Amino acid sequence: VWKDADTTLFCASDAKAHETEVHNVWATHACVPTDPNPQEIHLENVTENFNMWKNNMVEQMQEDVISLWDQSLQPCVKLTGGSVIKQACPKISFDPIPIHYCTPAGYVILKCNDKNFNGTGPCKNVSSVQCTHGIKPVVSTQLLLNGSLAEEEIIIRSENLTNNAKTIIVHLNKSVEINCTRPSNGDIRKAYCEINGTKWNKVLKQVTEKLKEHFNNKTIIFQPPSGGDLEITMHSFNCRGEFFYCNTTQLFNNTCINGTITLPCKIKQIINMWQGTGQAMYAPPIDGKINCVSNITGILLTRDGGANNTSNETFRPGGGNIKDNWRSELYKYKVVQIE
Numbered sequence: 378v379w380k381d382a383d384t385t386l387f388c389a390s391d392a393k394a395h396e397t398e399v400h401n402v403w404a405t406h407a408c409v410p411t412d413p414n415p416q417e418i419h420l421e422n423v424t425e426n427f428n429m430w431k432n433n434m435v436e437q438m439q440e441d442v443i444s445l446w447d448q449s450l451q452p453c454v455k456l457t458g459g460s461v462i463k464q465a466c467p468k469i470s471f472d473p474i475p476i477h478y479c480t481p482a483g484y485v486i487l488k489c490n491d492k493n494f495n496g497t498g499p500c501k502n503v504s505s506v507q508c509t510h511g512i513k514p515v516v517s518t519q520l521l522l523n524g525s526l527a528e529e530e531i532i533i534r535s536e537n538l539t540n541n542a543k544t545i546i547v548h549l550n551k552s553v554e555i556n557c558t559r560p561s562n563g564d565i566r567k568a569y570c571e572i573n574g575t576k577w578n579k580v581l582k583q584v585t586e587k588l589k590e591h592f593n594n595k596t597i598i599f600q601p602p603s604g605g606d607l608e609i610t611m612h613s614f615n616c617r618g619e620f621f622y623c624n625t626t627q628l629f630n631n632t633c634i635n636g637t638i639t640l641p642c643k644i645k646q647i648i649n650m651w652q653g654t655g656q657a658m659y660a661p662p663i664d665g666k667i668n669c670v671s672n673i674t675g676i677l678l679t680r681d682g683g684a685n686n687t688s689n690e691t692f693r694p695g696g697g698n699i700k701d702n703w704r705s706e707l708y709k710y711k712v713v714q715i716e
């Protein structure tokens with residue numbers, strides 16, 4: 378017999394003790410080795426209610442990635458709350474590794490295995506595990522990168538779709554590669570992302586069809602963000618330690634619903650921190666071909682309000698709350714206490 382509970386979790390990873398890469402270093406000192414033969418009990422005839430939007434596992438992972446970044450990614454200048462902090466800002470090795478989240482004795486993680494589970498409500502196919510699947514702490518906006526893919530069909534997630542101030546998490550069932558490079562050899566910050574056109578448009582079209590199911594068959598319209606900070610208006614992400622801000626106008630513009638889509642990007646040194654502290658300045662880009670190929674496995678959308686009297690619903694790429702990134706991977710899990 379069990380009950381929903383919150384407890385302090387621990388982590389497991391396959392980090393290398395000899396890696397200088399910051400994720401390996403953190404996990405080496407903060408996590409344990411993974412279980413090579415994980416046990417999983419499938420619970421017959423059990424219905425459990427889940428709520429991805431109010432899950433303490435999310436808060437706890439956020440606390441980790443903040444801790445990791447504080448120890449690993451110190452900027453030259455911190456601009457937090459009036460005070461200014463000047464530190465050394467050496468170039469580090471950066472590549473996220475899978476992190477597992479686990480329950481101590483007396484507790485178990487319940488895992489929803491329903492095919493098209495949207496993250497909230499009753500789950501019919503529930504199993505018990507000690508650890509989650511390995512989750513990379515990939516920080517980004519607009520597009521979710523290198524995440525897990527939806528099993529059956531594309532899934533739309535929201536705490537309350539009727540509320541437009543609530544972020545929408547689109548979960549893809551097929552990866553679309555995004556090829557981002559800062560070439561080696563006029564502008565050392567100029568960079569670009571390359572996406573297969575037909576692949577992306579086909580997927581976006583599938584996303585639109587899925588959105589119609591949730592919005593009474595109204596016509597779905599994509600638009601670029603209207604305002605806000607660059608971290609929101611642009612697909613921001615970190616590649617090899619470098620902060621990339623990419624223009625995604627070509628992605629979200631219902632013209633093609635063929636060829637390679639080349640998004641203009643720039644590596645920024647001065648960043649509004651996702652931690653919510655303030656602003657931070659980092660060192661200029663390293664030399665050489667800075668390249669990161671990632672799977673787009675999800676989209677963060679924000680819906681335009683004031684459309685109730687029209688047939689259109691307008692969706693713009695969003696983000697900013699990195700907890701949403703962890704929700705997209707932690708939705709099928711909740712912690713219960715065993716009695």
Ligand SMILES: Cc1nc([C@@H](NC(=O)C(=O)Nc2ccc(Cl)cc2)[C@@H]2CCCCN2)sc1CO
Binds near residue numbers: 648654696699
């Ligand atoms: C204080 C605070 N500010 C936050 C802001 N979010 C960010 O600054 C942010 O994500 N920055 C960011 C920085 C680097 C990368 Cl690679 C990706 C994102 C929000 C986003 C949404 C609208 C307003 N700006 S998140 C947050 C947490 O409390």
Ligand SMILES: *[C@@H]1O[C@H](CO)[C@@H](O)[C@H](O)[C@H]1NC(C)=O
Binds near residue numbers: 495499
């Ligand atoms: C998910 O399914 C639940 C019922 O299981 C339903 O109440 C809720 O509206 C759905 N959420 C979304 C975003 O489709």
Ligand SMILES: *[C@@H]1O[C@H](CO)[C@@H](O)[C@H](O)[C@H]1NC(C)=O
Binds near residue numbers: 490491492501502
């Ligand atoms: C639970 O998932 C299994 C495997 O996909 C499926 O066979 C079964 O029908 C699901 N249970 C129900 C009744 O939704």
Ligand SMILES: *[C@@H]1O[C@H](CO)[C@@H](O)[C@H](O)[C@H]1NC(C)=O
Binds near residue numbers: 523524552672
């Ligand atoms: C990228 O996507 C492909 C195709 O789905 C997948 O096989 C591969 O594991 C993904 N790589 C990741 C998750 O980094």
Ligand SMILES: *[C@@H]1O[C@H](CO)[C@@H](O)[C@H](O)[C@H]1NC(C)=O
Binds near residue numbers: 529530531550
């Ligand atoms: C992805 O999901 C969509 C519906 O959202 C479905 O039509 C399509 O078959 C899925 N793609 C694959 C290849 O599973």
Ligand SMILES: *[C@@H]1O[C@H](CO)[C@@H](O)[C@H](O)[C@H]1NC(C)=O
Binds near residue numbers: 537538539540541
């Ligand atoms: C969803 O949001 C709408 C619009 O803000 C609101 O009227 C409604 O109460 C919300 N639903 C729930 C379950 O709170």
Ligand SMILES: *[C@@H]1O[C@H](CO)[C@@H](O)[C@H](O)[C@H]1NC(C)=O
Binds near residue numbers: 670
């Ligand atoms: C990424 O794009 C560059 C050209 O801009 C190319 O040299 C490289 O091969 C690409 N990577 C892949 C795997 O397509």
Ligand SMILES: *[C@@H]1O[C@H](CO)[C@@H](O)[C@H](O)[C@H]1NC(C)=O
Binds near residue numbers: 590593
């Ligand atoms: C349009 O969407 C509704 C649900 O909103 C669906 O029931 C209906 O079948 C769709 N229109 C078609 C395919 O005739």
Ligand SMILES: *[C@@H]1O[C@H](CO)[C@@H](O)[C@H](O)[C@H]1NC(C)=O
Binds near residue numbers: 610611624625626
């Ligand atoms: C993105 O590029 C387009 C031109 O392709 C430009 O009109 C738009 O202002 C850019 N967006 C941002 C946020 O700079």
Ligand SMILES: *[C@@H]1O[C@H](CO)[C@@H](O)[C@H](O)[C@H]1NC(C)=O
Binds near residue numbers: 574576636
């Ligand atoms: C994208 O992938 C398709 C196959 O799905 C291929 O035919 C096409 O050449 C690719 N397009 C680009 C931009 O390379």
Ligand SMILES: *[C@@H]1O[C@H](CO)[C@@H](O)[C@H](O)[C@H]1NC(C)=O
Binds near residue numbers: 473515669
């Ligand atoms: C996504 O996964 C690939 C494959 O490991 C990796 O090379 C790349 O750095 C990842 N992208 C991001 C944003 O970290």
